[PDB]
Amino acid sequence: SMRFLYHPDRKDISLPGVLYALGDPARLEIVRLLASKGEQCCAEFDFAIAKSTMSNHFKILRESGVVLTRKEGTQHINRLRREDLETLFPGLLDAVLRSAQPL
Amino acid sequence: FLYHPDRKDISLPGVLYALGDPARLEIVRLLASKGEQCCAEFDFAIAKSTMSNHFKILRESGVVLTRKEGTQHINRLRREDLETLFPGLLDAVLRSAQPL
């Protein structure tokens, strides 16, 4: 494969949607890891979580506008939409990441 | 005061979850500018029990402190606690918050 999974346009990202997507210890930790380690394979996050719940987590991160997910080959690789979030919500990301605790 | 957690039990995912809703975010946005607000300043097209759950979520997550004065419920942003635990978060959020 060589394509990006569905992601909203900058136009359709809302502040409540982003906060909801960050509003979970697992998702917050995903974003924390994506912010510090760059792109990560979907399997990179082993949290002792039901795979259905982890799948829902990434889907929320994608649909909310936080995460850009790419499918290359068999696996899905995840990336923080840093420019989109900074342009829409200056200071939000750094404010959230400065306050997060390493899960 | 109504139910409210101790500062030790306020977490960031819980605060962000409480803010991650347009009605709840609107409540916080009003309380930040116009200060301690009683009463039905939060008149949205929402079920009464659902607006009540919104306030319960805001209280349980450590965002809002509510006290009863007469028949009225005076709500107050826990700015001190939130700034103490999560400096800059509230401003980062309010800077981009738009009226609903």
Author numbering:
A (entry chain A): 0 to 102
B (entry chain B): 3 to 102
Give verbatim lines from the article.
In the heterocystous cyanobacterium Nostoc sp. PCC 7120, one such strategy is the use of an ArsR-SmtB transcriptional regulator RexT that senses H2O2 and upregulates expression of thioredoxin to maintain cellular redox homeostasis. Different from many other members of the ArsR-SmtB family which bind metal ions, RexT has been proposed to use disulfide bond formation as a trigger to bind and release DNA. Here, we present high-resolution crystal structures of RexT in the reduced and H2O2-treated states. These structures reveal that RexT showcases the ArsR-SmtB winged-helix-turn-helix fold and forms a vicinal disulfide bond to orchestrate a response to H2O2. Each protomer of RexT has an α1-α2-α3-α4-β1-β2-α5a/b architecture.
To visualize the structural consequence of Cys residue oxidation, a 2.16-Å resolution structure of H2O2-treated RexT was solved (RexT_Ox). These crystals were prepared by removing crystals of reduced RexT from the anaerobic chamber and immersing them in a solution of cryoprotectant that contained H2O2. The oxidized structure shares a similar overall architecture with that of reduced RexT (rmsd of 0.380 Å for 1258 atoms). In chain A of the RexT dimer, a slight orientation difference is observed for both the Cys40 and Cys41 sidechains relative to the reduced structure. In contrast, in the α3 helix region of chain B, in agreement with the above-described biochemical results, the electron density is consistent with the presence of a disulfide bond between Cys40 and Cys41. To form this disulfide bond, Cys41 undergoes a large conformational change: the sidechain flips −167.8° and moves 8.8-Å away from its position in the reduced structure. Formation of this vicinal disulfide bond results in the creation of an eight-membered ring with the peptide backbone and distortion of the peptide bond geometry. In addition to this observed peptide bond distortion, the movement of Cys41 disrupts the interactions seen in the reduced structure between the backbone and sidechain of Cys41 and residues His75 and Asn77 from the wing of the wHTH motif. The lack of a disulfide bond in chain A is proposed to be due to crystal packing, which would prohibit a comparable movement of these residues. Through this analysis, it was found that a cavity leads from the surface of the protein to a cluster of amino acids that includes Cys41. This cavity contains one molecule of H2O2 in chain A of the H2O2-treated structure and one molecule of glycerol in chain B of the reduced structure, suggesting the possibility that H2O2 gains access to Cys41 using this route. In the oxidized structure, the newly formed disulfide bond is oriented towards the protein surface and perhaps coupled with the architectural changes in RexT, more favorably interacts with reduced TrxA2 and permits subsequent resolving of the disulfide linkage.
